[PDB]
Amino acid sequence: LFIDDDTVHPLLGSHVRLTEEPERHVWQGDVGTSVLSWLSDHQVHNVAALPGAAYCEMALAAAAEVFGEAAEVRDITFEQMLLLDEQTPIDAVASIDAPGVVNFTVETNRDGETTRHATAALRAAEDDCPPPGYDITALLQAHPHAVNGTAMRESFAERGVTLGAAFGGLTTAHTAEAGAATVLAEVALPASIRFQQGAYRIHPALLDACFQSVGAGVQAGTATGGLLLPLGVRSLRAYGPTRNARYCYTRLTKAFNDGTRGGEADLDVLDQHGTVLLAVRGLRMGTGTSERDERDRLVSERLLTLGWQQRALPEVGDGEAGSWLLIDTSNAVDTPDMLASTLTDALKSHGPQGTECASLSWSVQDTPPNDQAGLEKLGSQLRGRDGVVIVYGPRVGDPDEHSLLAGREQVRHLVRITRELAEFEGELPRLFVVTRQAQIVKPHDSGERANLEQAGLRGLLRVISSEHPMLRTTLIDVDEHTDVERVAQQLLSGSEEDETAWRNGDWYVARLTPSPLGHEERRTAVLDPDHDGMRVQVRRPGDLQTLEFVASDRVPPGPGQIEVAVSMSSINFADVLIAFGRFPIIDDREPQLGMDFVGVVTAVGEGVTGHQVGDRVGGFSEGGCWRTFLTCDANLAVTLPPGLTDEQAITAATAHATAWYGLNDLAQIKAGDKVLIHSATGGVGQAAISIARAKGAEIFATAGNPAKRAMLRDMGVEHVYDSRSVEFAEQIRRDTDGYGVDIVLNSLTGAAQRAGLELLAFGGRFVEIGKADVYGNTRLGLFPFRRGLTFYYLDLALMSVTQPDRVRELLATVFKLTADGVLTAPQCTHYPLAEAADAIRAMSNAEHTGKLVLDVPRSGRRSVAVTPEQAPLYRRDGSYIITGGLGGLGLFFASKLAAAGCGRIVLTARSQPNPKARQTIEGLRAAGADIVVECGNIAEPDTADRLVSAATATGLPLRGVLHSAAVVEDATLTNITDELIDRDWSPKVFGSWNLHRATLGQPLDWFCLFSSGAALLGSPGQGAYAAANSWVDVFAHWRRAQGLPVSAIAWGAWGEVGRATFLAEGGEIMITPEEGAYAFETLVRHDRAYSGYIPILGAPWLADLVRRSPWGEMFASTGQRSRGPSKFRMELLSLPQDEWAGRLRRLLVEQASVILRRTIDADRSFIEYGLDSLGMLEMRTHVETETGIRLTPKVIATNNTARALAQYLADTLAEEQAA
Amino acid sequence: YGVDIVLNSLTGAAQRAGLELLAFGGRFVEIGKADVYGNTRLGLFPFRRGLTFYYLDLALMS
């Protein structure tokens, strides 16, 4: 036992006055957890990351260093936050840019690159007037109803970031009202850290705590979902050492018009009165990403879809001593129960011990006079004994009109059967329902004729078994390969799950799964490049393997715009940059693949001459040149001269164009002068070699590995060196008799190029293409310029954008110089366009030699192309119709379609719209969209015939269609009237099937329908609508197998605590149409058949959604746990008083062992173990926190033994409980 | 829009700011002396606009 033995600003780490031009202040330090162990508390997603407050103190300290006192920092903004390792290298620099103006940024170099994290201005000393003060007592009076600080800590922790312990303060959050725009809090550093106040202007923990005060907001529901992070503040005004800082005051400027965005609050601090030590202005707090990104994440996590899991029979043969009874309830078919008889034989025989299985058959209902027979035979008397099985036959059925009519009455007879079983009071064994190809299953074998009559049986099964937790129903799907013997073996036990299936010779299980949108599932179309607009693109930056084809759509020739079908295209060096996402994307140009093209004119504009349709033409264009059809300006393109083939033109021009430009216009080669080319093996290098050889000048060159240097000798150029090295310059010096070079073309960076300038002699000319060095601002030392140098940077794209005429003249010039043969093509290393990934590798990895060329097969072909997000959603040339559009969601859809300027909009209200709906429709009609109303009942087939004929008779083809019917009741199965069944089914089915058969010829770009979220389980009462909803999903599968697009969406409001959410926020939600409108727009561009757009994990509906069905794919908790008020005391008082002694004795022993760091004996004194006054204080404070008993040393002295102390505490608890 | 051509003899922040003032493809010609011998740490970043640099001395050219 011994001591461990373990002035500079901590975060800055060191200061240096780099007093060059411009003058720069530089700081270098470390902020890892090894030094700042306290900083480890600030962790988001259990990952230690410093808050943005850390930069603010860094900026304040830097400004104080450079600006002296009265320092201030303006418009600080945060980049991506820093992940705190044990040690982390952090660097900050402040530089003078204008007289009296200094800009300051921070960054962290890593693995040869760097990432900036905060930028701010250091202009300060604006005024001498101290900021005015204000009455703290008046604010405190005006702000009652303060919220406990630890509650805010829990709120932040559950939102993703836990603050640990070192981030104390913010004891209470005082507010004026429920809509108060200003709050204040009492803030102070923890005792363990309070000593650190002498090393900061503002302690980072205290500042972050002040930021945490914003979490109170106008309401506790401010930014109800997700976590917010600060993005910096407009201005920061430090005016006093916060050594004595006690309270902080805020002003929520209510920039959160949505209640979530920005915040833009102002923070002040004070002490005991209207002191103002630090002022914070315009805090970008309610932030984190774009609202579009927020909605994308919300719809990603708010969408659900059932999932099917293959597995062996889980509980096969585990049942024993049962007595089954199989009843066929589908004997309207001639022989449905023949397969069920084997199930009875397997159940009766394979079952161990005296296991048996009776067999029965019956029509589903046949006639009303033969009702209640099932109840008497099984449901009331012969059940109870272990085993009940219900079979509906191996029937398959083409969903025609006859099948639809049969299925409606079939589900009616289903509810008739189930009603009697529900009404029975006795216990019922778990049911075994048998159906063939009717359960909703994975797209595997999700074809045609899938017996939709039997498809809707799911929706009611978990309504009867929700009021009766017993008889837990399990769905099984039958097929020819299901091997019914195994099924009955599974039926012999009945494993606890709801849905099972058989799409091959193996067993399946089904449960709900989260539904994030996939990318390979996107809409496709078999397109012909001969006439269909097609383009290539990358799915995500940084992954070249994600190259994919996308329908580029036809592009008619605009004003003065030419249209060209590509014959060939090349690969620019910038392509790999955009391919890997490291392209200089700052300019927000969103570049694509291809700056160059060659081909034949497809179409001609009106403001264009010279060029004409059919001309051989090549040129440069943006928007990506790797597309079948392209429309751009004529001046960007030049007619190919005769003899000059497109193949040679595309592979030679661009590199030759750049080289000739640099060597003829920027520099001017004088025959015999000395020029050097970096990486001559490159296409541009070969082009420059050709230009120089044409110009008859002395040539030096360099390249990579000796293989890349071999062809250089093969083309017969001397002075060949290794580009990867830097010693080439002095080698040239001695190889040029000490005299330097005249012109130099560089593709290198860093020390390589600066040596190049050092090699330049007198009137040297320097031309650079390297994107990296110029964009990195790693400025070259300009001392060698004294020789009289000229520096040029070249970007053909920039000139093309700004001076199309000049680049056009250059292209014509190089075309002529290639036609006459004075210029040689670099290489003909062609590669397939569809396999451009390996070309990207070859250029990026540079393992290849020479110029890489393409091959463009997509002149005319046939393949499936993934449609983009540009896919048609609104069309002037399109008719649209909605059923139930008078509903709020339908009203929003109509409003957005009219605002979008769609062609025609038809509506149906199942007899006629209500007067208010008619008034809203006529008000919206002034927008010009053809809004028309169709009468009749969707349940009537001729009404749908009208919807396909007369609605189309408005004058446009019908493309967008949707159905939006719904039920308005949640009564249990016993109360269901046939009127409700008819109104739920007949409109739905007579819309779906009739519009499917009656709209085949129409373009029909999309088709969607509404659904209920509980359709997988049924509402506690509603079973009929759930059954109806769990019928369209298979119908969607059936229609997709047919081919036409179809989709379905379940609808659910924002009931995270039920109805109380809306009453707490706005009282009225109409099932969240605003976010649904976004999803509806996305869902139009989606082909997924069915999905549940329902909130999850937040609603009380989660509890039943995870226990009603014993299945689970998402954990029903986020790991956040609450703490009971005096946890041990309540559970202790639950026990009888005699137990209390030992029960609290165990806790006393644990606490004493924690304090003393050693084991103890309850009957022995703490003093003999080493307890002291500090230990006594610790133990009594813990006791107060747990049992709230004022333990005092004289009590401790009398009860120095843990047993006696526990007995005294038990007696005290008994006395106070008696009181 | 900025300027197209700059003939500069100033030093330090003056030329630095003026160099930014150049428009796309601008021409910068330098005639002063202090900066070139001072190895001034200017900013290579604005060269994105396709700038061109020229250091001038009649004596050396002669």
Author numbering:
A (entry chain A): 876 to 881, 894 to 2106
B (entry chain B): 1626 to 1687
The authors write:
As exemplified by isoniazid, which targets the enoylreductase in mycolic acid biosynthesis, mycocerosic acid synthase (MAS) offers a potential drug target by producing part of phthiocerol dimycocerosate (PDIM), a key component of the cell envelope. MAS, a fully reducing iterative type I polyketide synthase (PKS), is composed of six domains that together catalyze the elongation of n-C6-C20 fatty acids to prepare mycocerosic acid. Using a combination of dual covalent crosslinking and cryo-EM analyses, we elucidate the structure of mycocerosic acid synthase from Mycobacterium tuberculosis trapped in two distinct catalytic states during its iterative cycle. These structures reveal domain architecture of the acyl carrier protein mediating condensation and dehydration through dual site-selective crosslinking of the acyl carrier protein with the ketosynthase and dehydratase domains.
We obtained a density map with 3.87 Å resolution from samples of the ACPs = KSs ( = indicates crosslink) dual crosslinked protein, complex A, including all domains KS, AT, DH, ΨKR, ER, KR, and ACP. Both ACPs are crosslinked at the homodimeric KS domains, linking Ser2060 in ACP with Cys177 in KS with the C16 acyl tail bound within the canonical KS substrate pocket. The crosslinkers tethered on the ACPA and ACPB through a 4’-phosphopantetheine (PPant) arm are well resolved within the KS • KS’ binding tunnels, each making a covalent linkage at the active site Cys residues (Cys177 in KS and KS’). The full MAS structure adopts a homodimeric architecture, comprising two catalytic chambers (chambers 1 and 2). The dimerization interface is comprised of the KS • KS’ (2566 Å2), DHA • DHB (429 Å2), and ERA • ERB (1165 Å2) domains. Supported by partial density, a 14 residue flexible KR-ACP linker (L5) allows the ACP to travel between the domains of each of the catalytic chambers of MAS. Due to the flexibility offered by the linker-based architecture, complex A is not perfectly symmetrical. Distances between the active site residues Tyr1912 (KR) and Ser623 (AT), as well as Tyr1912 (KR) and Ser2060 (ACP), are 78.1 Å and 71.9 Å, respectively, in protomer 1, compared with 72.4 Å and 69.6 Å inter-residue distances in protomer 2, revealing a significant in-plane tilting movement of the modifying compartment that pivots at the KS • KS’ core. The AT domain in complex A is in the apo form (without substrate in the active site), consisting of an α/β-hydrolase and ferredoxin subdomains, sharing a similar fold with other type I and type II systems. The absence of observed “turnstile closed” conformations in MAS complexes A and B implies that iterative type I PKSs utilize a different mechanism to prevent premature reloading of the KS domain.
